[PDB]
């Protein structure tokens, strides 16, 4: 009769799917609550500058 | 939390009063005492004279 392309016939899946996703690259920036300076300035008086 | 102090501007008016007692020798002079003091400038001199 004739020939047929492979895609012309319905394909049923005989495979089991596993969707493994990678862990994304991340960056940590320098973060701090109070800098060394802020702590120095927190004092009411400084002997050196006085 | 806030740890920095509240900062503002101020102006200080005062007078440095220094009274010195000196003994004059034959060939030299000497300090027998130097009294140094700080005195407030009154309101009637800050407003009326300085300002």
From Swiss-Prot, chain B:
Post-translational modification remark: The cytoplasmic tail is phosphorylated by the viral kinase US3. Phosphorylation may be linked to a down-regulation of gB expression on cell surface. ubiquitinated.
Superkingdom of origin: Viruses
Region described as Involved in fusion and/or binding to host membrane: 22-28
Subcellular location: Virion membrane; Host cell membrane; Host endosome membrane; Host Golgi apparatus membrane
Family affiliation: Belongs to the herpesviridae glycoprotein B family.
Role of this protein: Envelope glycoprotein that forms spikes at the surface of virion envelope and binds to the host cell entry receptors MYH9/NMMHC-IIA and MYH10/NMMHC-IIB, promoting the virus entry into host cells. Essential for the initial attachment to heparan sulfate moieties of the host cell surface proteoglycans. Involved in fusion of viral and cellular membranes leading to virus entry into the host cell: following initial binding to its host cell entry receptors, membrane fusion is mediated by the fusion machinery composed at least of gB and the heterodimer gH/gL.
Quaternary data: Homotrimer; disulfide-linked. Interacts with host receptor MYH9/NMMHC-IIA. Interacts with host receptor MYH10/NMMHC-IIB. Interacts with the host coreceptor PILRA. Binds to heparan sulfate proteoglycans. Interacts with gH/gL heterodimer. Interacts with gD.
Protein name (database record): Envelope glycoprotein B
Gene from which this protein is expressed: gB
Portion of the full-length sequence here: 151 to 201 of 903
């Amino acid at each position: 009769s004739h020939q047929l392309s492979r895609a012309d016939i319905t394909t049923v899946s005989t495979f089991i799917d596993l969707n493994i996703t990678m862990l994304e690259d991340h960056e940590f920036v320098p973060l701090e609550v109070y800098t060394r300076h802020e702590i120095k300035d927190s004092g009411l008086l400084d002997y050196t500058e006085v | 939390e806030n740890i920095a102090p509240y900062k503002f501007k101020a102006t200080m008016y005062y007078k440095d009063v220094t009274v010195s007692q000196v003994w004059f020798g034959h060939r030299y002079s000497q300090f027998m005492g130097i009294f140094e003091d700080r005195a407030p400038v009154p309101f009637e001199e800050v407003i009326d004279k300085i300002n």
